[PDB]
Design a protein around this ligand. Sequence first.
Ligand SMILES: [Cu+2]
Ligand SMILES: [Cu+2]
Ligand SMILES: [Cu+2]
Ligand SMILES: [Cu+2]
Ligand SMILES: [Cu+2]
Ligand SMILES: [Cu+2]
Ligand SMILES: [Cu+2]
Ligand SMILES: [Cu+2]
Ligand SMILES: [Cu+2]
Ligand SMILES: [Cu+2]
Ligand SMILES: [Cu+2]
Ligand SMILES: [Cu+2]
Ligand SMILES: [O-]
Ligand SMILES: [O-]
Ligand SMILES: [O-]
Lengths: 278, 278, 278
Amino acid sequence: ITARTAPAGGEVRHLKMYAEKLADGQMGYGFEKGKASVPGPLIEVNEGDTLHIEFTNTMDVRASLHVHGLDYEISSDGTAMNKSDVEPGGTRTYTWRTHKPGRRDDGTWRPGSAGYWHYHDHVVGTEHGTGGIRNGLYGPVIVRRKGDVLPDATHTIVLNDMTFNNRKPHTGPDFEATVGDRVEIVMITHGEYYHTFHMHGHRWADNRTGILTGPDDPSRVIDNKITGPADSFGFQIIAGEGVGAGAWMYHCHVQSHSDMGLVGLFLVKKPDGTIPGY
Amino acid sequence: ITARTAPAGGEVRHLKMYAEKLADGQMGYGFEKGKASVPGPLIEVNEGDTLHIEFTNTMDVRASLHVHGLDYEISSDGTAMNKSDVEPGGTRTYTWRTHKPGRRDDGTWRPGSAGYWHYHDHVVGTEHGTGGIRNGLYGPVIVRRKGDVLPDATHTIVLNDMTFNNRKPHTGPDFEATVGDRVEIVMITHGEYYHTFHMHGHRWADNRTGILTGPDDPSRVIDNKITGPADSFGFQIIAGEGVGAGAWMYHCHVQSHSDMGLVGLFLVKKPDGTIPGY
Amino acid sequence: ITARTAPAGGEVRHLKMYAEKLADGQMGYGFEKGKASVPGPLIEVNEGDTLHIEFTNTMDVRASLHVHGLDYEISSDGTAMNKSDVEPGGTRTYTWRTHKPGRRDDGTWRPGSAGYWHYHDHVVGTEHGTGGIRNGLYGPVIVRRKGDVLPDATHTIVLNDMTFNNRKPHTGPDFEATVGDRVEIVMITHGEYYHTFHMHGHRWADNRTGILTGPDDPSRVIDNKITGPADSFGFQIIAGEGVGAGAWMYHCHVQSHSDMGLVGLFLVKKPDGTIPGY
Ligand SMILES: [Cu+2]
Ligand SMILES: [Cu+2]
Ligand SMILES: [Cu+2]
Ligand SMILES: [Cu+2]
Ligand SMILES: [Cu+2]
Ligand SMILES: [Cu+2]
Ligand SMILES: [Cu+2]
Ligand SMILES: [Cu+2]
Ligand SMILES: [Cu+2]
Ligand SMILES: [Cu+2]
Ligand SMILES: [Cu+2]
Ligand SMILES: [Cu+2]
Ligand SMILES: [O-]
Ligand SMILES: [O-]
Ligand SMILES: [O-]
């Protein structure tokens, strides 16, 4: 493999993170005050890394930070039950740990932390963060395994109820690439409804990475994946591979969801920057 | 393996295909005028084959042909956005390509086109073919990999909203086999609802083919699979294997869906042609 | 592997089983009269075992016993269509068989019976057991493969409509373990709604066993699994592995389902018996 690969982990990382009420009524996470985003900023670490997140709740209600898949003690649960949320104006240091796969003492195989995970609030609105998740307090986490193929860019599409990334329907989001780009998509589903993410002209493997290890990988290859609340998956694709440039749309394939406007455009450009038809 | 296996692909195939309004108000695809069917005719190719489909829209509304999983340029998208639908009375030549898996230049593994896919309309009713799919404009596509085990027969069951193959509830469809037959089922889900396809007395592997490669295949073995709009899977079973002949029913396992009449019969006969109990 | 492993099967087991109307209006299965439970008693066998179940319907309505995944002749279908239910006060002997994986005569690989399966009624209320399943006539079946890692304890959580194990919402069930225990969870979904089972601080492999074979297992590692009616999966976890002791909650992640009270506690204790925070 002559592509860029993820290195071995084991670094202790430090992060500052804020929960912010936005002008439009939404709430979002951010690395800087006044720079909150919906979805929240992407957190990407390697297996074995430890992450210390100094989380400050700038909001006037209790907020928290709860992560999937990663290792964390009960004190970083992010739940009210476990005294792990953050008072308004307060600041709390969460700790997320990751680990490499390996053989246990009993001879069994312990899985690693690698995967496409996500974080979200767990105390806003209800004791399960129904209000915070609805308002936009969610974000992706990528834990890479040593040797994982690294992409040229990573895009996050979050199916939050009847919206993509809390955007108004019929407004995308659209993103761009050039034929041959290695594009990584992180997909998170939140809310109350099930969905089916479909992508025109592209396909991926239904496994951890979206890529096949080789000729022996039995993982099914799909272009349509069913998804439910708190499901997080991701994949990589070669933009326009075998299909060329064009406005390749993606959408939920529940018929009235795509009719509602749960549609976006994966704009793959020719090397001259143009898209067939425009 | 002394069973019939799929050969290597690479042939350029040509197909004529029509979109037809049926007498009962449905719309269906067909290879011959007056011979349209719901679901549409099965298209089965090998990895590496190229398929040229001369599609004629005999209907009085705009129709199109959109396929999953297979390679196609933006001009064969089958969408109105990409000027790829067909005017009433018009004729357009779509091109679907398939490719074998292989090593990329960067050393990564490119997946093949093999799988249980499907095609459907994308412009009737709405810009996502909600009307065409509802009316019956859908059909299965099978792309085989070299060496894939070939069945004795292939049956298509499409869960379109609250119907099997757009049939009236409580009317099947039923199909037959003899104990020992290698039966292939292609399952496509369309519409607005999620379902769970269940089969009495039989089970399959939850992978691309429904079959295990061997003792090292980690794919789970199931008899109940959750499914959503535009999901397409398939499998093969030995009829009556380990269970004998009988009227083995299949149904959606959502309780009121099977109560509604989303039930069919997999009639497996003894070598004398009889079914236990009848 | 120095952990306890499942032995080779091939024993002919005999079981007595009752269908009982409970005082609160529910119906449940049991091995002894007056000792019925919801969910029903766990049945655990090895691949190759044969199970003879003398089933007695103590109820005043027709009841039956239908199993998933296991081998059974048409006479043990448990359906009214196949004359396989049990009259009120009647007694019928069902036979479930299991088989090991192996090579077929044609050279193909026949899958084994191993997996996390379940049994339920099929004639109470409707011809699909909608009434019996609702009333609590469901139970887990575990078929082990030779060499499968054996747990310290097994817990069954059944998502029946808007309840866990037909319990009142906000009432668990909760169960306990000590840090380091090998805990097995069997998850069955019944009824009309889809769900997503999520577990704090723990994760498992999305395959047959919930465990990875080793460094070559491509199965995705998850902590959130979408599930529908008659879906049955299971996994094993090391309680508190990498996260420590604490009140680790599990819940459906459909937002108002967890808000409704579809939440339980996986109480992992320190070696001194205490849970952090209490
Ligand atoms: Cu939670
Ligand atoms: Cu949707
Ligand atoms: Cu498509
Ligand atoms: Cu969550
Ligand atoms: Cu589409
Ligand atoms: Cu259904
Ligand atoms: Cu069944
Ligand atoms: Cu489609
Ligand atoms: Cu059934
Ligand atoms: Cu639920
Ligand atoms: Cu969680
Ligand atoms: Cu069932
Ligand atoms: O589509
Ligand atoms: O069933
Ligand atoms: O959560």
